[PDB]
Amino acid sequence: AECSVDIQGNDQMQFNTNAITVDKSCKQFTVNLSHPGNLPKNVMGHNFVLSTAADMQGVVTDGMASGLDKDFLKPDDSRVIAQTKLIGSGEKDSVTFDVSKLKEGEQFMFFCTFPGHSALMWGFLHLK
Ligand SMILES: [Cu+2]
């Protein structure tokens, strides 16, 4: 839809998009994450995590240290605007968030917090 995006994270440690623009008419925005491939969550799990660009590093840093069972995310992290679960191949997860949490002119980034993945698995999101 206009107010959602389907995104894939694959066994090549890559998202199939690196830029998302959100229409100002959207009250909510939904991201549907899926995982083509064959590798399980413990070696190639992906999540979709959204924060301001400013916060990306801190979110990734705390997440990796939080470990696998916590989906590589710090619990109750207020820097995170939206997050999916960490998924393995063949699994899928969605998240919806309020577009009011986005700001005009500000850059947000989405990324995977599985250790190292953010080297390639990142993109920008901003209001259209
Ligand atoms: Cu990943």
Curated annotation (Swiss-Prot):
Keyword field contains Disulfide bond: yes
Keyword Metal-binding: yes
A molecular function (GO) term: electron transfer activity
Disulfide cysteine pairs (residue numbers): C3-C26
Entry-linked NCBIfam families: azurin (TIGR02695)
Cellular compartments annotated: Periplasm
Residues in Plastocyanin-like domain copies: 2-128
Cellular component terms (Gene Ontology): periplasmic space; plasma membrane
Pfam families the UniProt entry points to: Copper-bind (PF00127)
Alphabetized InterPro entries for the sequence: Azurin (IPR014068), BlueCu_1 (IPR000923), BlueCu_1_BS (IPR028871), Cu-binding_ET (IPR050845), Cupredoxin (IPR008972)
The encoding gene: azu
Keyword field: Copper, Disulfide bond, Electron transport, Metal-binding, Periplasm, Signal, Transport
Function: Transfers electrons from cytochrome c551 to cytochrome oxidase.
Binding of Cu cation, residues: H46, C112, H117, M121
Name recorded for this polypeptide: Azurin
